[PDB]
Every structure is written in C-alpha cells, then in structure tokens.
C-alpha cells in the first residue's frame, strides 16, 4: 500500500500548509512569552513616574 500511504502523507502535509496559510492563530504559546516580557518591561518603565 505504498502509493496510498504516499498520497495520504502528501494530503496531510497539504492540510497543515492550508491551516497555517489561513488566518488560524496557532502560535499563542510563543506569543505569550513575548507579551509577558514586553508587559514587564512596560511596567518597569512606568514605575519611574
């Protein structure tokens, strides 16, 4: 069943490509770190007033 397994793998790679090429927000775990670090720096800057 090598040809069937090849076509299923290609279809799965294409569906991963589609769900990333759409506007589905999937990198939230990576965006959280940037948001928390930026917010901590903004609070540390606003403590000077």
């Amino acid at each position: 069943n090598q040809k069937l397994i090849a076509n299923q793998f290609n279809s799965a790679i294409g569906k991963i490509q589609d769900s990333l090429s759409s506007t589905a927000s999937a990198l939230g775990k990576l965006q959280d770190v940037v948001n928390q670090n930026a917010q901590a720096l903004n609070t540390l800057v606003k403590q000077l007033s």
């Binding site: 903004n42 800057v45 007033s49």
Partner: protein, 50 residues
Amino acid sequence: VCGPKKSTNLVKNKCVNFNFNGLTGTGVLTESNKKFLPFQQFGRDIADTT
C-alpha cells in the same frame, strides 16, 4: 517671571547641556518636524521626561 540669568546661543546636533526656563538636563538638541498646537510648551513620554 524669568529670574535674572544671562542667555546664550543655541547649539545643535551634538551632546551638550541645556537650561530652558529651569528645565535642566543633558542631551542632543536636534531640530524636529512635528508642530505643536500653538498653546503648548512641554512634551512628555512614557517615563514622563521631556
């Protein structure tokens, strides 16, 4: 009111001292391109410096 101290020249584009009506500090005085509204004097930022 403007207490009695003699004024000097305005030097730009290099790290100098300044004193604008009591506003002491140290920095580079580059000319700007953003017009105020004609009743405003200061300007501030997130840390509330000029």
